[PDB]
């Protein structure tokens with residue numbers, strides 16, 4: 001009969017503006033993923049970059065209906081990403097919540113890098129690199145700083161020079177004790193990063209393998225940024241879901257990659273079925289496609305926190 | 319920034335409680351379907367009958383997220399079907415509406431039978447048969463009576479004897495000039511129907527070919543009711559989307575059916591690319607899987623009608 005509506009402001013008020021709830025949710029989500037206690041159908045892409053993608057899954061059940069188009073910050077002064085998340089009571093399959101998706105999507109994706117870095121980043125890394133200063137990049141940086149205490153330098157690059165400058169400026173004001181560096185190109189930023197996170201909207205790869213320091217960990221969030229050579233030269237390659245990944249497909253289609261060469265799925269690192277980083281020289285690549293269970297678990301946790309604090313707008317269905 | 323929320327009551331107030339708006343919407347939708355001016359990805363089923371199914375499509379863009387489970391009227395006194403429809407501005411892919419789905423879903427499905435019967439039912443048919451007295455069956459009957467003036471008898475069967483009796487009683491009160499007949503079994507109901515509509519929730523087929531009158535048209539809405547023999551013995555077999563249909567797949571997988579044997583897709587009848595019924599003896603079977611474009615077009619039309627009358631709850635996204 002009733003559904004709770006939670007806009008971005010309600011989500012922020014409920015605690016969705018901090019990484020810890022997303023870390024807990026994904027730790028739960030990825031654990032269930034490693035034990036196959038999920039139902040995650042292949043996402044259909046609705047295309048007229050420019051796309052709308054339905055991400056349904058069961059762990060709670062639900063779906064993320066997130067739209068995107070590149071023209072947005074450029075032409076219409078709107079965020080690229082936008083959409084809604086529906087939560088369903090598995091006992092009933094009736095919808096129980098309608099929630100804004102973009103903030104949750106960005107924070108959970110930031111939590112992916114956090115959990116992965118916990119297992120894959122080198123010990124006592126100090127230099128963090130952020131490529132792309134959009135909503136994703138901002139949340140990636142926010143979450144890393146909240147979860148890792150001794151991040152000392154942050155290298156930032158964005159194709160948009162003003163977007164990068166504005167990004168660096170306000171973050172330098174938020175954390176005056178941390179040295180934020182605005183780089184002239186991607187190479188400088190990547191070269192100086194012990195942990196590298198890609199948060200761009202490109203189709204063509206640019207990150208070369210020799211840019212990466214020994215012992216570096218790269219969280220390839222935006223996926224397309226990384227050259228094929230990194231997949232074959234990295235000491236360890238980690239994905240979220242192998243079946244989902246099949247850029248890797250063509251490497252498998254060609255005589256260049258396979259599941260046997262894959263180190264682990266992210267859920268296996270969490271459960272401790274497979275070790276993470278095993279020495280300080282290893283270059284490790286994370287290639288997450290994003291999973292619907294990550295959004296549903298996150299939204300569900302936030303939904304509960306909102307209800308406990310009586311946050312949100314109650315809607316009637318009939 | 320803003321979305322319009324339309325619950326079932328708002329949808330009814332906006333005019334979504336009558337067939338004509340759905341007929342117009344699907345006529346537009348099916349016309350676009352016949353010219354391939356759509357993007358309709360294969361629906362993923364989320365299964366823990368018991369299912370939740372994501373139906374995204376572009377014509378307007380959007381998705382129907384409709385949940386179902388059989389236990390509902392039986393155990394928890396709730397409707398089997400429930401869910402939401404999201405509408406998206408293709409220029410922006412931003413969501414512009416959140417709408418209740420079950421009423422729209424049932425009415426558009428009722429419109430499918432209407433439009434098909436317009437092309438496939440015999441001239442001056444008087445006897446209508448409804449198998450299944452759920453929300454679907456009620457809307458099927460309502461729409462047929464609104465769209466066809468001289469329906470004289472309505473044969474009704476349901477496994478639930480009380481649900482059928484209650485169905486027949488109140489409909490007999492709504493239309494005292496029409497003779498509603500409560501049958502003891504499916505065979506009597508089907509045997510006496512010039513137009514037969516299946517609206518049940520079964521897994522096993524029961525409708526035999528020899529039950530069907532010469533010149534009869536069967537709208538197999540609930541799909542599973544019809545024996546394989548009807549597909550191969552019917553003079554004309556019509557579907558909504560052939561690629562979607564692949565019960566037909568196994569017939570194709572076996573040496574029993576193919577696309578060449580298929581008469582037409584429903585959109586082709588609407589555009590007049592392919593003739594409908596061509597004589598009074600032909601037994602014609604419609605096997606619609608349901609298409610997302612049918613829901614999105616319907617919801618969009620209703621969305622506009624609601625806005626013109628200022629109906630609904632305005633929600634903020636941020």
Ligand SMILES: NC(=O)c1ccc[n+]([C@@H]2O[C@H](COP(=O)([O-])OP(=O)([O-])OC[C@H]3O[C@@H](n4cnc5c(N)[nH+]cnc54)[C@H](O)[C@@H]3O)[C@@H](O)[C@H]2O)c1
Pocket residue numbers: 073080081105106109131132133134135136137157158159160163199200201202203206220221222223288289290291
């Ligand atoms: N893997 C996942 O699970 C996941 C989840 C959510 C989003 N994403 C991705 O995150 C990416 C960025 O999202 P967003 O920040 O919100 O979009 P955005 O707000 O448009 O930010 C993109 C920014 O990247 C900048 N950029 C830097 N280098 C390049 C380059 N070489 N080419 C093009 N642009 C460049 C660009 O200037 C722009 O400001 C998208 O590509 C999404 O696909 C991934």
Ligand SMILES: NC(=O)c1ccc[n+]([C@@H]2O[C@H](COP(=O)([O-])OP(=O)([O-])OC[C@H]3O[C@@H](n4cnc5c(N)[nH+]cnc54)[C@H](O)[C@@H]3O)[C@@H](O)[C@H]2O)c1
Pocket residue numbers: 391398399423424427449450451452453454455475476477478481517518519520521524538539540541606607608609
């Ligand atoms: N083809 C489409 O596009 C489309 C769209 C929407 C719904 N549907 C189908 O419509 C069907 C019915 O929906 P609903 O009426 O809302 O559900 P419902 O409200 O549960 O009604 C089902 C009724 O069918 C009755 N019934 C009669 N004969 C049988 C039988 N042999 N086995 C089982 N039940 C029987 C049963 O008693 C029950 O009352 C579902 O199976 C849906 O899949 C199809």
Ligand SMILES: O=C(O)CCC(=O)C(=O)O
Pocket residue numbers: 053055066067068081082105289290291
């Ligand atoms: O923001 C987007 O473009 C959608 C990304 C996403 O949901 C995913 O695929 O993980």
Ligand SMILES: O=C(O)CCC(=O)C(=O)O
Pocket residue numbers: 371373384385386399400423607608609
């Ligand atoms: O009510 C249901 O079970 C969903 C039916 C539906 O949306 C379809 O497949 O056409």
